[PDB]
Amino acid sequence: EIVMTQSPATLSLSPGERATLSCRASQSVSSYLAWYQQKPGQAPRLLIYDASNRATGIPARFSGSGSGTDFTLTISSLEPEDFAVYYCQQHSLLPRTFGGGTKVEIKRADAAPTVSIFPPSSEQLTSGGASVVCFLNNFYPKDINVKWKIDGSERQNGVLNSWTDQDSKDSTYSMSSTLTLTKDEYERHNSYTCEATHKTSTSPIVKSFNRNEC
Amino acid sequence: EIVMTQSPATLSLSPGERATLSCRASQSVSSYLAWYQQKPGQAPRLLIYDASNRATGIPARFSGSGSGTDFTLTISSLEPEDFAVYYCQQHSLLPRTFGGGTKVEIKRADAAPTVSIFPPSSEQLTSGGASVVCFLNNFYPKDINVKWKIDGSERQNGVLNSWTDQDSKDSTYSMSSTLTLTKDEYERHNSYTCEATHKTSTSPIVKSFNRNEC
Amino acid sequence: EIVMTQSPATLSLSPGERATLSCRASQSVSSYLAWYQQKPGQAPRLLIYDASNRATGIPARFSGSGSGTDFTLTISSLEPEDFAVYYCQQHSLLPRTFGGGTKVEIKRADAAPTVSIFPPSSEQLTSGGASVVCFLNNFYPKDINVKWKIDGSERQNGVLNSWTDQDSKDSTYSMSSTLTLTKDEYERHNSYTCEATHKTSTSPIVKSFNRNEC
Amino acid sequence: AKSRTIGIIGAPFSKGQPRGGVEEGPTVLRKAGLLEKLKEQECDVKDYGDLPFADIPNDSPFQIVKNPRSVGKASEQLAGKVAEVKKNGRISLVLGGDHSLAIGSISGHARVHPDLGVIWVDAHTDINTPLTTTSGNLHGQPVSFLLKELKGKIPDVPGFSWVTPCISAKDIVYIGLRDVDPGEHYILKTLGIKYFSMTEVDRLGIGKVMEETLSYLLGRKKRPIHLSFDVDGLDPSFTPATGTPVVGGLTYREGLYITEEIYKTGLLSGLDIMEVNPSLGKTPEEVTRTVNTAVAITLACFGLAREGNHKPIDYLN
Amino acid sequence: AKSRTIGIIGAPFSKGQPRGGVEEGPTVLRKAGLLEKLKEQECDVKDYGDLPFADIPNDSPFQIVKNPRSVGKASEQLAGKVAEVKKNGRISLVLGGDHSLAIGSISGHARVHPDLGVIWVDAHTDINTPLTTTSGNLHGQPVSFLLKELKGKIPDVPGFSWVTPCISAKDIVYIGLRDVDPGEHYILKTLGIKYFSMTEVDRLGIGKVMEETLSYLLGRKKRPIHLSFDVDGLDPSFTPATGTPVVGGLTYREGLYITEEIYKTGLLSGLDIMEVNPSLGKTPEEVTRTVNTAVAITLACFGLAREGNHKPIDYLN
Amino acid sequence: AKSRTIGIIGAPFSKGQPRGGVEEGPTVLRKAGLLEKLKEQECDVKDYGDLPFADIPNDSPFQIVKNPRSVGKASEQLAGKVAEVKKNGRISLVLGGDHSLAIGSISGHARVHPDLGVIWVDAHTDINTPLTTTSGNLHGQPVSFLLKELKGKIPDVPGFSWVTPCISAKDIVYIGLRDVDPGEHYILKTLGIKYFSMTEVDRLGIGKVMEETLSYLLGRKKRPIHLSFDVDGLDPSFTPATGTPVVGGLTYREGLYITEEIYKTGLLSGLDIMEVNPSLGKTPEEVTRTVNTAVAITLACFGLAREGNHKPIDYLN
């Protein structure tokens, strides 16, 4: 049992220069560990087999080093098809731990989210439910805290969030704030606020609507 | 591990003709399974040892067949002493599962329950409790849903039911609806309803009483 | 697995005569068990190794007997440095259970607790908490039940107690009644009672204070 | 070559022994890759498939012998298939199953070679008759239908009308006996069958036992050897997933030595691997040890010596 | 018969060895049915019951020897009972317990047969004296009270005033030595006792070892054999539930071979089964393997050969 | 004495074999107290410490042979240290590690004694060349750099420019072969190396095997014996925590007998304990059995007979 730690937890580097990564071992794995290229929704493709030597079908640019505690993975010719989570794997000690994840993002000028909210349908009120979802579209980077409030008094334990992968063209992100309430708790209150907070937003953007307003 | 399934979950056949049962295996047990006669409160008496051959003290009528996936148990001369739960047991694969249960009931013209309710005693109010039990006596078949209500608003998580075995003479069933409330929740409300529902009852029979009515 | 039972659960004997203890086995350990002297906050020092024979550095007075089910430990010359919890250990059967604990206290004329209460600080009200602790100091013996009340209606699940070891000089005990409430539940009520009960107290001593009284 | 020219015959049959589960005999021995582990060394392996064993519904037992007709029909079908694969000049590797199949597996072998010798490696003698049995299981009675000297002490068991006794009492050798009935030991001492029980194996050692065995069968005249190998004859620390395990058995070393000395005669002409029961291992690791043991026994029957084997070309090139 | 005429003597005694729990020695060996497993073959089994061993309260130890008086009184009571069951012409099956009982179990046997020979199957020599011991446990000193040549190197241990040294140094054979003290090995090489340690057992094999053992004891004159069998002398893979297990022991095959060759002399006249400790198995399966091993050793002492046994009537009827 | 004058050389090296974890070879064998268990009997134990093995960063492999420069530098450093401890007149106890170190551990031994004989106790022959390998691991190729007859069939592997072939084909004995490559078996039959595979060990018994081994090496002329002992050559029931275990191995009894017969020649002059891997035991109990087995093998190499040992003074005082 050896914990394998990766020092860049996330990474955002524009298509261009080197993007050297890190994988630190808790013991001396001693030039016996590997590297991977798990794209989202794919099988983890092998990059490097034992700390170097560029395993069998890698294009030109994924050399690494090691021997034997803190290893590197150099992406010298970044090539924007390579935007995937990278994993380091020790192998010559059991059990066989992996790294943590090295999500190489895309690096652009920080985009503001389009903070937009929607009431539940009247069809859902005929079912007995109330799902209030605030959609935040086209933002960069990821980090947004969204606060729901009962007419100004904050909401917990009903909020669900769905983050996207980074988009291919504008390199932004999208997010729902899925808040589900009952039919009774819907009809008790009116002003349903979506307090969004992004780094581009100097003030916390609060998007709201009253019940039966539209 | 082989799940043994019995196709008649329950059975109700009057003293008379054949009552052929079913035991389906999930593999090929191949003429290596058994049959049993667990009377209520008794030890499971052996009927058939390996798919036939009438094991050593069976009267005249409990032949079966098989070989090797879906087996039968014929009760050709029904004989109303035989009203007991029957179990099939595979043996030549481990672990040794049994069947599910084949509760051969008595088959009569469907009886109406005498839906009767009783308040808790005043002795119980001097203890701090309130047990409201609605007794349903002499019904056939078993299936009755009983609904308790807080003066018309339904009750949950305090209702206990005690079903009898089928009676020897009239072949009916009996059932308590044991509802236990506190002393405080007793004194809050008056009309304590027993909404009973039997197949003989075209309308749901509601038996009720007010608090301190009798 | 043999449960080893000690018949004096507690013990209080003044510096003086014999203080013979008990260790009953559930089988025949047959002269193969031991004795210990765990002082509070110390390592359990060995008294007797196999039912007798005074193991290697014991002063003059810790002889015992046995062979083979219910054993004794004689403290003939009591010597008030010996006020510690004593443990008997069976050894020649696995697993190796110990006794229960034989807390030899100090035996004086029973002291009354100084039942004293304190409000939470106003500093704690600026934090959002309310810790109401009733200190009971210099009592003997240990047994005191302390009741907290919401202006006369009893309190549960917030009461913590911290008992001391018996003091060296006056041979008494001390106890906090650590009751922690919120800032809101503090401001709802005023009279915060400490219903203490000691054997010297013929009446249950209730120490109280109003909110913002002092 | 003359040896290691294998015709595999599966036989998933269980109605001789009570512990149901040896029907996955050929299935587990093939899914552990017995064919592929034979095909490295020069083995002309031809799989003849598992046999279709029908289910006779009115399988009325004998007095104590139970399921007689199913075992008789199964062994007749197996003896036909073994005679078929021995007319092709192969070595009849039969693998079941249970020892009840060995009636047909030796009778069909004796339809082609009437002068064979059986090395019956088993914990038990399996020489019970339908009159002297206590269990009545037909995995304990294959030998007593085969011996010529027991003609007359065998009742006409239904389904066994075809069985002609094919071997004599002085042409069979037991290796590994450690659980013998009183009736079995009385038959074994009356007929004078040369047996090497675990007393003699502990005394002489497996080298002297195999030397005396091959001198007893092949010393007078070179003749086909039919190793009928049981997996409870080995010690249950090595094969726990068998039907009737008896502790204190042949070690895995000694079993491999028996099969290697049978191979180095070059006169092996039929192999039986019976009583493998993968449904009785308390862990899957126990099943894995049992099946790897039986596969290693078969591979050492067909040429895999523990000292190593090389193809006859120069490797320093 | 002359042999297999057993008088069982239980002896639930533990105060020689430290690991308490061998008091369930006869209880577990009887509840595994040693009596009923003897009574199939022609064994006139007469249970003489467990002995009542008193608890001496002031059991003051010696210098290093601990609990001396309890062991001395227990062995005197056992020697009286063994002399009683050998005046009845039986075979004194004693089963404990621990090796500290073997003082009485050989002395009471020598009160009837003064010319016996002891086959001491043990992992250890148990030949420590009260002067050369390190543990001081009396399960490691039964032999040195019995040898005639060690008269004078034994202090007057309390409770052992009755012990007369009964056997000589050339009338005892060790089989299975693999954990010997320096004092024990010095005594064993000074007295010249014929010992078969695990080096000689690995060299010669258990056949040659038992042949040389029976030629050493019974070659000059036929005399009673007193097999004093320990269950740690077998390998701890077979008997893990013993007091002092030492790895690399006699296999279960070799132990059964020793007892079968002792039986086939027909001169067995006393059996000791010591150091069975059912409270030390890490699983109940370990206790089950230990007790089944010791029961199988006793049954193979009293006639159950692994090749099989039959009553002398015709079975083909 | 002349023997049991030990110079321990640790060698925590792993870059020959794939299963990383044998770097805790000397660490676990020393923390089990090999030094202290040697120091009871008269052993002038001098710990020469673990060797510092550098990490060559650009360790570019050969065609199939992988990590060549690290193994070559490690064996050169080890051969220097072994020549140092053999100029002090000791017995070069080397303990690793893996068999890739045995190149240096025999070469440095042959720098002092040019006429040594290697008893290579291993499950494998380890006689693969860089041309005939399939794994390419250098724990499978130490012998083929050492044999004088294989000069010319060995390419100039980088890091092995210093290796002079030091022993001949008729001066090495294999004991325990049960997993041999086709290339390995072809080399073993071409050179005519006297090997005792598990077929011959099951046939002759370990007494006859060790007698023929010592007669093959020491029968013509008394010469230093270099026991290079592997812990997968023993059966994996005794050492499961090794690199490449192969079932059906030498029992713990037979391994102790081999080492005792090597000691009783008095000509042991170097011991190698390789392939101990404490990170592969499925339980810590498996690691405990492996390390206690290897420690007992080393202690029986240096005088601890199973029959017992005593210092030459009177103990009855």
Side-chain angles (χ1 to χ4, degrees), chain E:
Chain E
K2 294 180 181 179
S3 177
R4 62 181 189 273
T5 305
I6 297 99
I8 295 172
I9 299 169
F13 184 71
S14 68
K15 291 180 182 179
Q17 58 92 34
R19 298 293 288 272
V22 307
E23 288 178 352
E24 292 179 352
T27 301
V28 182
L29 288 176
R30 287 178 181 176
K31 75 189 283 182
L34 184 61
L35 281 78
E36 291 85 2
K37 286 183 182 180
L38 280 169
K39 284 181 182 180
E40 286 89 7
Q41 65 270 18
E42 291 86 1
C43 293
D44 193 3
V45 174
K46 183 176 179 180
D47 193 0
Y48 289 90
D50 296 335
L51 295 176
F53 296 112
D55 192 1
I56 295 96
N58 288 318
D59 197 359
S60 295
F62 192 71
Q63 298 176 356
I64 311 298
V65 173
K66 293 179 178 67
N67 293 319
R69 293 177 179 89
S70 297
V71 175
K73 184 67 176 177
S75 293
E76 183 178 1
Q77 185 175 1
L78 181 60
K81 185 60 70 177
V82 170
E84 183 179 2
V85 306
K86 292 297 291 183
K87 287 179 183 179
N88 288 319
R90 293 182 184 271
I91 295 171
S92 67
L93 172 56
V94 181
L95 50 97
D98 55 351
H99 264 168
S100 68
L101 297 168
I103 298 168
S105 178
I106 296 171
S107 296
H109 191 196
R111 289 178 182 176
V112 176
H113 295 286
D115 53 352
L116 57 91
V118 172
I119 297 173
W120 188 270
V121 176
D122 188 0
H124 309 88
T125 60
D126 284 343
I127 203 170
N128 278 314
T129 64
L131 295 176
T132 59
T133 183
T134 61
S135 67
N137 296 317
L138 285 174
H139 79 93
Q141 306 181 0
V143 177
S144 64
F145 292 105
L146 295 173
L147 291 174
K148 293 181 181 180
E149 287 85 3
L150 292 175
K151 183 185 286 185
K153 298 293 183 181
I154 298 300
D156 290 331
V157 180
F160 292 97
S161 65
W162 60 270
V163 174
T164 301
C166 63
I167 62 171
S168 295
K170 64 182 182 293
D171 291 331
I172 182 168
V173 175
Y174 293 104
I175 296 170
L177 302 180
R178 60 190 182 275
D179 192 2
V180 180
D181 304 344
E184 286 175 348
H185 185 266
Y186 179 72
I187 292 171
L188 189 65
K189 295 297 289 184
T190 303
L191 298 179
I193 294 172
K194 184 67 179 294
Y195 64 97
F196 290 98
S197 65
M198 298 302 291
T199 300
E200 289 86 3
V201 177
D202 286 328
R203 180 182 298 114
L204 299 175
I206 200 66
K208 186 70 175 177
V209 167
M210 286 304 292
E211 184 177 1
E212 289 181 353
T213 295
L214 297 172
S215 178
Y216 182 77
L217 296 180
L218 298 176
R220 184 176 176 87
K221 183 174 71 69
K222 302 295 188 291
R223 64 186 179 181
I225 297 297
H226 180 80
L227 175 63
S228 177
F229 184 80
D230 197 347
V231 298
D232 63 4
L234 292 174
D235 190 75
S237 66
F238 296 108
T239 64
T242 184
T244 63
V246 176
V247 296
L250 298 172
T251 60
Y252 175 75
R253 292 169 59 188
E254 289 174 351
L256 290 175
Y257 182 75
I258 290 168
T259 59
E260 284 175 352
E261 293 293 328
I262 290 167
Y263 176 73
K264 288 192 286 186
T265 62
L267 294 176
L268 183 60
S269 178
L271 179 58
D272 299 329
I273 303 299
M274 300 299 172
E275 293 286 332
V276 174
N277 199 347
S279 65
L280 301 190
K282 297 180 181 180
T283 65
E285 195 273 335
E286 292 181 354
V287 182
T288 305
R289 283 189 289 112
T290 298
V291 176
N292 287 322
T293 299
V295 168
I297 289 299
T298 303
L299 291 174
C301 289
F302 294 111
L304 194 145
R306 289 176 292 175
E307 66 183 2
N309 295 112
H310 70 282
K311 298 180 177 66
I313 59 170
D314 192 2
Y315 284 159
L316 295 176
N317 291 319

Side-chain angles (χ1 to χ4, degrees), chain D residues 247-276:
Chain D
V247 296
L250 298 172
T251 60
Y252 175 75
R253 292 169 59 188
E254 289 174 351
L256 290 175
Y257 182 75
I258 290 168
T259 59
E260 284 175 351
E261 293 293 327
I262 290 167
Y263 176 73
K264 288 192 286 186
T265 62
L267 294 176
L268 183 60
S269 178
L271 178 58
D272 299 329
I273 303 299
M274 300 299 172
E275 293 286 332
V276 174

Side-chain angles (χ1 to χ4, degrees), chain B residues 125 130 182-190 192 211-212:
Chain B
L125 295 178
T182 63
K183 183 177 174 66
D184 293 331
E185 293 178 353
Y186 183 76
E187 297 294 327
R188 291 177 182 176
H189 296 90
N190 297 320
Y192 293 164
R211 180 180 61 84
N212 291 318

Side-chain angles (χ1 to χ4, degrees), chain B residues 33-56:
Chain B
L33 73 86
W35 290 98
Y36 294 97
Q37 197 187 4
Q38 182 179 2
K39 293 177 71 67
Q42 296 295 320
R45 182 180 176 181
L46 175 69
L47 299 180
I48 287 177
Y49 58 103
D50 54 358
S52 179
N53 292 317
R54 294 181 65 250
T56 68

Side-chain angles (χ1 to χ4, degrees), chain A residues 50-101:
Chain A
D50 54 358
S52 179
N53 292 317
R54 294 181 65 250
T56 68
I58 213 62
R61 61 188 182 274
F62 287 173
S63 66
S65 294
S67 70
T69 303
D70 45 352
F71 290 24
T72 59
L73 174 59
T74 63
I75 315 298
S76 179
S77 180
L78 195 276
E79 187 64 31
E81 67 181 2
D82 298 331
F83 287 144
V85 187
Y86 292 173
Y87 292 100
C88 63
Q89 171 195 1
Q90 63 170 357
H91 191 80
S92 297
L93 197 275
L94 195 147
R96 270 69 175 266
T97 55
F98 289 9

Side-chain angles (χ1 to χ4, degrees), chain D residues 278-301:
Chain D
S279 65
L280 301 190
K282 296 180 181 180
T283 65
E285 195 273 335
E286 292 181 354
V287 182
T288 305
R289 283 189 289 112
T290 298
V291 176
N292 287 322
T293 300
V295 168
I297 289 299
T298 303
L299 291 174
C301 289

